[PDB]
């Protein structure tokens, strides 16, 4: 996997590749690693496919039950539920999750949750095996309060490089835009991003 989430002026954008592997065989080349836990709270999944799916399903259940009683949960609340599962079951889990959501009060927020189950609130986050190759690039190129088009280009260029160098990453680049306007899905194919 290569995954990332980036806050910007109007909200936050999540990004991911589409490759799932068993050793060197690609079990699925069109995977969707960006998943909904609430209307405007989404997550990027890295690590074990089974573990991250099981976790995301449980979180979705918790936030649905939260909404029924207390109304819309904050992005921080969602990250806390992810943490609780990842931390308490750290011995039996291989899951690197990035949580991203849009409030109207708090605007765009990004929380990253590594293997240990620690929580880290950041302006932007990167994760997955392919992220190692773009720490240098992303640090040099990230700016706060970017526009939508700038952030899409930042994510597209970043994941393009991650995909290029990481064998465990590839396929299409999926993205999910979270703003006050709503939820927008984007896709970008190899023929475009490879020759960037």
């Amino acid at each position: 996997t290569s995954i990332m989430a980036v806050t910007f002026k109007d909200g936050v954008i999540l990004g991911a590749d589409s490759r799932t592997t068993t050793g060197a065989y690609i079990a699925n080349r069109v995977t969707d690693k960006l998943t909904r836990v609430h209307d405007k709270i989404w997550c990027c999944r890295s690590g074990s496919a089974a573990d991250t799916q099981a976790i995301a399903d449980i979180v979705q259940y918790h936030l649905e039950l939260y909404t029924s009683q207390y109304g819309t949960p904050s992005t921080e609340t969602a990250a806390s539920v992810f943490k609780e599962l990842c931390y308490e079951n750290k011995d039996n889990l291989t899951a690197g999750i990035i949580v991203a959501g849009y409030d109207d009060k708090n605007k765009g927020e990004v929380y990253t949750i590594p293997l240990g189950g620690s929580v880290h609130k950041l302006p932007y986050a990167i994760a997955g095996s392919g992220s190692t190759f773009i720490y240098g690039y992303c640090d040099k190129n990230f700016r706060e309060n970017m526009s939508k088009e700038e952030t899409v280009d930042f994510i597209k260029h970043s994941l393009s490089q991650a995909i290029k160098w990481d064998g465990s990453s590839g396929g299409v680049i999926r993205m999910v835009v979270l703003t006050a306007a709503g939820v927008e899905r984007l896709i970008f194919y190899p023929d475009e991003y490879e020759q960037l």
């Binding site: 060197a24 069109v30 998943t35 064998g167 194919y189 190899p190």
Partner: protein, 230 residues
Amino acid sequence: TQQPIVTGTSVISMKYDNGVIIAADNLGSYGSLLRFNGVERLIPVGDNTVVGISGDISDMQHIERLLKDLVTENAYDNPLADAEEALEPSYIFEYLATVMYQRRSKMNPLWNAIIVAGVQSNGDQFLRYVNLLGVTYSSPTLATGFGAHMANPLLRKVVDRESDIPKTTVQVAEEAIVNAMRVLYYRDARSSRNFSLAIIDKNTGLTFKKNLQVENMKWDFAKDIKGYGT
């Protein structure tokens, strides 16, 4: 006792009516890191043989040097070095097969899988495989690594037995090879889009094609796929 460091993936090949085709991508992987992109893994020997090599690249470069030196040694005191006493594909193979088995027998192998493709002096198609264990075999289609699992099934639909070889043209054969290379790019995590292809024909001779790319790819259906279940 070794472990392979910088590696090359599948080499694929098949016979057709007048000759043989062989192909391999231009990638040099360093584990999961796709380190080197300008690596040529098809090495011609004379104008009648191409040796395709997968596995460890340091050992591939050693084998290159051996073949290069073999050409030099054959030319010594040999007036017919470019005629009757030129290096045949069968000679080049048997030499490599000997080396591979001797190295495995000394518990210090050349960590490779090799396919020698070419045309003999009498016009007969030559295509044979050898690997780090010294295991050798021949078939109308041959492939290494992931190619063995994914390419061979596709190539065997064209040439399933011996009698299917005369019925297979160079146009049909190359189409199948190029298709197989696309499939490997979809499914092999240590493959690249860029590759080389070589044709050895009994009439038109050796044609070496560099800087080819996988194209006409189907990715559009990906946009419709959402989630993992619900």
